[PDB]
Ligand binder design. Structure first.
Ligand SMILES: [Zn+2]
Lengths: 102, 454, 121, 126, 171, 134, 74
RNA sequence: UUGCCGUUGCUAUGGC
């Protein structure tokens, strides 16, 4: 059973966003399991599962803890506006390939 | 003078480091971080709460309604209580039984509701340290802890298990073993208004759990003897005390760092301090804690000390040397075996082998001005801490509790200026860890409740 | 001079009880009066701690004669209850013994306590 | 603790090494230097040319033993009292005494070489 | 590290024989490394003795040196003098390593059993599994050397040999 | 003549004089505790590195504070890492023994010259030293 | 149809003497030359083995009334 | 008001 801890929750009205640091705790598990972590984050906060996102995962030595960077949006459309395209390729729906020449 | 030169050179050093009040006094980085402080959320859990309940001299002391409800369980060990924002209490014994009480009928003795008794039936069929997932206690339940929300009680003892029982039925919902051979739990404390438990296990270890997720958060290491007591408040700090290493540590649990506080009273300098014009001495083992607020706490020792410690001083702020008396010396008909009283008196060596009572229970009411100490002197003591927070002082005594006090905690009633509390104290005739206790002087295994007023 | 003569004061008592607790964790402590006299006549003992307040006193005063015979330091702690609590068992003990070991991780501490109680004695 | 003899003292003064400070920065340990009464007898018998060496051997930091034999043969006295006990460093520069001492086992040997003292049969010098 | 002056004298060979046999060392490089940095330590303490009392260097670097030597654990709490740093030596330093300490605490039956426990990761001081044998445990990490909870000598699930034998005996 | 804006003289240096012996004495006589870690959490590569030194855990705490503070991972920037990580870990395994660095005892740097013996409060008058005492 | 190479052409250990299993590990060699050394030490000195084990049976090896193994002075 | 047992109160105590 994974365990979740949010810390230092601030609000960004300019980016319509709420951001925090994510202490993810998995004793006798491998690692963070980021999609399941987005599920757990989207249910501890409000619904917006295609508007919650995590990117900066570092597991400490020997496992157990990992610190990530969590940012949760309202309004999935403006989340699609404000998130970068590589994270949208990683998690959500966007896929535009670069033209392979030279 | 070498220490004078050390102090002088350290002062010059700090002056030089400063080298490398006006009308304008504003610093850009400080005010930017204060803008981020105005931007952030969650001013809820992390209150550095000071002492906001100044009521020590206010309430009455000497005429409490003291009911010592004796129960038929050998050597009660712990007491857990609960208040929402009807009140239940919990006791547990060395006879492997948990017992639920109702306590909310305030003017009278508590009411038994439900047993939950483990026994020899719950010994595991493996003797293997990770299939310890049975549903009951087979050895020596040492501590209970009620949830701050009241869905669960969680208990554990020398069978190295944490069994979490439901409140409404006293049923084991989940079993979490501590996965090693010496992993006996000795103290449990929820952080206040939460679902997070801090257990202190004799592996020099502190385990943390989230109870409603059935998960373990963090194991944190660092004491040097068994972590005999634990204490927590609404902050994610914690305060533990290991027994014989004579240090109390407090843990930033997310950072996994600590502040250590050693003791350090010596009878040489103490008897010289009295010699400038006396039966007091060094320290055995720091035993019990309770975090009074988020800047101070208090420790109960093995030589009867009660000490008051701040968050900003390694050495303690205040001591109180003898807090429950010195024990009655062993009789001349039970020391020597000679015939004459002169030689049987010579076998007492005067005052050299008088040992003090050791405080085996201490409870600070959270953020309040008053704490309660208990041992087998027969009389609980009530002390209030002065409003400048650099001393405490004995208010009164509660003399209706014959036996060892294995647990003290209080139950609140009344509003902001008019209040009444019932002090529960588990009374046994045997210390909560080993036996060690002779001269059982009229003790009974009961619950000493007192109703204090105003 | 009482019968339980070379008693320790409070600082030496706590030094003794701390190394007793560590030897009990390291399986280097034989606790109890007849186990102590067994290990004393066997010769595997570095110093013996007797508690000077048990209900008779000659019950352990038999041991100073044995220690004197075999030249072993002996010291009197003034609490059998604290001695048992340091020994780590759930009862008071009246005598305990630190057995000799050279694959022992507390040999310096045991030797320092031996020197202190021998200059006392 | 280091037993000195006369040519070690003479070579110390000829190379301008202090006795206890040269011993300390040779061994990186605290040294107790010992002048036996036969080494002292030999320094006194060396005459009034060696007054500087004699009153540098007269030093309160250099402790001194009391040999109990007839005659003042320091090489015999040093060899006997070192092969009796094996708790001694021998500081010497005699070739014959150096060969005797390094033939008897377990005895470290110190000697003035260059501008500081050297030590050979002590296996823990760094 | 650095090689000694006369590396092949018979006292040095019997010295290294006793050290490597009594502490389970693999070669001469363990002794030479720990003795090289001990040489630096007490070559510094020699200069701290050759300067005088009430020298600032002596006062501050002396109590700094003896306090961090006490916290490494090679020096006891009561000898807070600076000549004990000169009396210090090499096996006082390699009694502090984790192989020696595992054997002395009795989790292993010899120093070689301790070395293979450490390199097979059954030993964890504090939180982290330590896996190299020459670790130099400190006076606060002295009492949390225990079996790792990820290991069958702790309380964990038994290894591949035990479970394969159990399966084949179940067949 | 005229003024010229000098950030090197109103910049916080505080490091020319930061000596570890003085800082250790201040930590000894500090009378407030020191934020030490739970004891296993500060060793680094299962013991393949050291424990970690006090300056290294201070620098690690600073990096994680800046890290969480503006949401950015630091990187593997080649020139700075080939200098600092390799030279730092090699002098760590040289001089850091058991979580304690002994490099300073092997280093010529005068204590009283730079970090003690005050320069502003030099008191070069009998009257000024008399008023500085009284 | 793949004529694979074999061990003597692969590792090329041409014509070596017979060597030692204890030499294949640097640690086990010093474990077994220290056991040899401390078995030789019982021959030269007399080693304190740990005192009297059980009942004193006797000297078990002989008593010489002519030999005196004590260091005379000068 | 309890594992027994006694005084019990018409509720409090004290021996294992
Ligand atoms: Zn002579």
């Amino acid at each position: 059973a994974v365990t979740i801890r949010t810390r230092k929750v601030i609000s960004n009205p300019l980016l319509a966003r709420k951001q925090f640091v994510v202490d993810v705790l998995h004793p006798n598990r491998a690692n963070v399991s980021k999609d399941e972590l987005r599920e757990k984050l989207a249910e501890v906060y409000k619904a917006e599962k295609d508007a919650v996102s995590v990117f900066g995962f570092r597991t400490q030595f020997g496992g157990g803890k990992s610190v990530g960077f969590g940012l949760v949006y309202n309004s999935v459309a403006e989340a699609k506006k404000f998130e970068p395209t590589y994270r949208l390729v990683r998690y959500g729906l966007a896929e535009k390939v670069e033209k392979a020449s030279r | 003078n070498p220490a004078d030169k050390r102090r002088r050179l350290a002062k010059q050093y700090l002056e030089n480091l400063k080298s490398e009040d006006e009308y304008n006094n504003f610093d850009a980085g400080d005010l930017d971080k204060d803008i981020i402080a105005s931007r952030l959320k969650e001013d809820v859990a992390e209150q550095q709460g000071r002492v906001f309940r100044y009521f020590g001299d206010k309430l009455l002391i000497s005429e409490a309604k003291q009911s010592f409800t004796r129960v038929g369980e050998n050597n009660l060990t712990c007491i857990s209580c609960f208040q929402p924002v009807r009140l239940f209490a919990y006791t547990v014994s060395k006879d492997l039984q948990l017992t639920k009480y109702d306590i909310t009928d305030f003017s009278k003795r508590p009411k038994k509701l439900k047993y939950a008794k483990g026994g020899a039936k719950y010994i595991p069929t493996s003797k293997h340290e990770y299939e310890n997932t049975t549903e009951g206690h087979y050895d020596e339940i040492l501590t209970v802890a009620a949830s701050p929300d009241g869905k669960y009680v969680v208990t554990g003892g020398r069978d190295r298990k944490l069994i979490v029982w439901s409140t409404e039925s006293l049923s084991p919902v989940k079993v979490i073993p501590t996965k090693d051979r010496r992993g006996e739990v000795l103290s449990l404390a929820f952080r206040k208004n939460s679902d997070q438990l801090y257990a202190s296990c004799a592996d020099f270890k502190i385990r943390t759990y989230s109870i409603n997720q059935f998960s373990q958060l963090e194991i944190l290491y660092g004491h040097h003897d068994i972590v005999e007591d634990i204490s927590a408040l609404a902050m994610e700090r914690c305060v533990t005390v290991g027994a014989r290493d004579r240090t109390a540590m407090l843990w930033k649990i997310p950072d996994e760092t600590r502040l250590t506080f050693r003791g350090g009273d010596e009878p040489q300098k103490l008897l010289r301090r009295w010699m400038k014009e006396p039966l007091f001495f060094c320290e055995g083992s720091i035993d019990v804690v309770s975090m009074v607020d988020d800047f101070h706490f208090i420790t109960g020792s093995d030589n009867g000390n009660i000490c008051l410690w701040s968050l900003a001083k390694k050495k303690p702020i205040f001591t109180e040397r003898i807090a429950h008396g010195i024990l009655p010396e062993p009789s001349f008909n039970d020391i020597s075996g000679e015939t004459d009283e002169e030689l049987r008196k010579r076998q007492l060596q005067g005052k050299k082998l008088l040992q003090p009572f050791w405080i085996t229970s201490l409870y600070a009411i959270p953020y309040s001005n008053v704490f309660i100490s208990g041992s087998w002197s027969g009389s609980l003591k009530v002390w209030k801490i002065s409003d400048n927070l650099r001393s405490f002082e004995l208010l009164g005594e509660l003399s209706g509790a014959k036996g060892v006090v294995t647990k003290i905690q209080v139950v609140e009633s009344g509003k902001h200026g008019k209040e009444k509390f019932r002090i529960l104290a588990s009374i046994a005739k045997e210390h909560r860890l080993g036996r060690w206790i002779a001269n059982v002087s009229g003790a009974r295994n009961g619950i000493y409740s007192a109703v204090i007023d105003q | 001079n009482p019968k339980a003569f070379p008693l320790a004061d409070a600082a030496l008592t706590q030094q003794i009880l701390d190394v007793v607790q560590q030897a009990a964790n390291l399986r280097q402590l034989k606790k109890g009066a007849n186990e102590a006299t067994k290990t004393l006549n066997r010769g595997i003992s570095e110093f013996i701690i007797m508690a000077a307040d048990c209900e008779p006193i000659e019950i352990l005063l038999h041991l100073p004669l044995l220690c004197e015979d075999k030249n072993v330091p002996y010291v009197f702690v003034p609490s059998r209850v604290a001695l048992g609590r340091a020994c780590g068992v759930s009862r008071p003990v009246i005598a305990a013994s630190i057995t000799t070991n050279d694959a022992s991780a507390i040999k310096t501490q045991i030797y320092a306590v031996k020197d202190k109680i021998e200059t006392l004695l | 603790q280091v037993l000195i003899d006369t040519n070690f003292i003479n070579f110390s003064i000829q190379k301008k090494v202090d006795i206890v400070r040269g011993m300390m920065d040779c061994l990186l340990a605290k040294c107790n230097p010992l002048i036996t009464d036969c080494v002292m007898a030999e320094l006194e018998k060396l005459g009034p040319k060696y007054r500087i060496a004699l009153k540098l051997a007269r030093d309160p930091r250099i402790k001194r033993l009391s040999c109990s034999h007839k005659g003042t043969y320091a090489d015999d006295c040093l060899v006997h009292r070192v092969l009796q006990h094996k708790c001694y460093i021998v500081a010497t520069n005699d070739a014959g005494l150096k060969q005797r001492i390094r033939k008897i086992p377990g005895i470290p040997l110190m000697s003035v070489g260059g501008h500081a003292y050297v030590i050979e049969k002590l296996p823990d010098v760094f | 590290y650095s090689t000694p002056k006369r590396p092949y004298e018979s006292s040095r060979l019997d010295a290294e024989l006793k050290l490597a046999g009594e502490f389970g060392l693999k070669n001469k490089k363990e002794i030479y490394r720990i003795s090289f940095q001990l040489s630096k330590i007490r070559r510094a303490a020699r200069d701290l003795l050759t300067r005088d009392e009430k020298d600032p260097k002596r006062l501050f670097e002396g109590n700094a040196l003896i306090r961090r030597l006490v916290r490494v654990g090679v020096l006891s709490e009561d000898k807070k003098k600076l000549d004990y740093v000169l009396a210090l030596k090499v096996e006082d330093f390699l009694e502090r390593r984790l192989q020696t300490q595992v054997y002395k605490l009795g989790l292993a039956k010899s120093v070689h059993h301790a070395r293979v426990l450490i390199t097979q990761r059954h030993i964890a001081v504090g939180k982290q599994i330590v896996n190299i044998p020459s670790f130099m445990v400190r006076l606060d990490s002295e009492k949390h050397i225990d079996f790792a909870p990820t290991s069958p000598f702790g309380g964990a699930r038994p290894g591949r040999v035990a479970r394969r034998n159990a399966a084949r005996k179940a067949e | 003549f005229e003024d010229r804006f000098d950030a090197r003289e109103h910049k916080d240096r505080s490091n020319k004089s930061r000596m570890q012996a003085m800082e250790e004495y201040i930590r000894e006589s500090s009378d407030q505790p020191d934020w030490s870690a739970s004891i296993g959490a500060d060793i680094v590569n299962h013991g393949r590195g050291g424990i970690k030194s006090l300056r290294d855990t201070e620098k690690e705490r600073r990096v994680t504070s800046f890290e969480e503070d503006n949401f950015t991972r630091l990187n593997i920037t080649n020139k700075a890492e080939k200098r600092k990580q390799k030279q730092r870990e090699r002098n760590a395994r040289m001089n850091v023994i058991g979580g304690e660095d002994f490099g300073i005892f092997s280093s010529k740097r005068k204590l009283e010259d730079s970090t003690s013996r005050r320069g502003a409060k030099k008191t070069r008058s009998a009257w000024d030293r008399a008023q500085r005492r009284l | 149809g793949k004529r694979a190479i074999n061990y003597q052409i692969l590792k090329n250990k041409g014509l070596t003497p017979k060597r030692n299993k204890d030499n294949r590990n640097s640690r086990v060699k010093k474990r077994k030359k220290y056991q040899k050394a401390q078995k030789k030490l019982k021959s030269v000195r007399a080693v304190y083995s740990g005192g009297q084990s059980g009942v004193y049976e006797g000297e078990k090896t002989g008593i010489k009334k002519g030999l005196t193994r004590s260091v005379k002075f000068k």
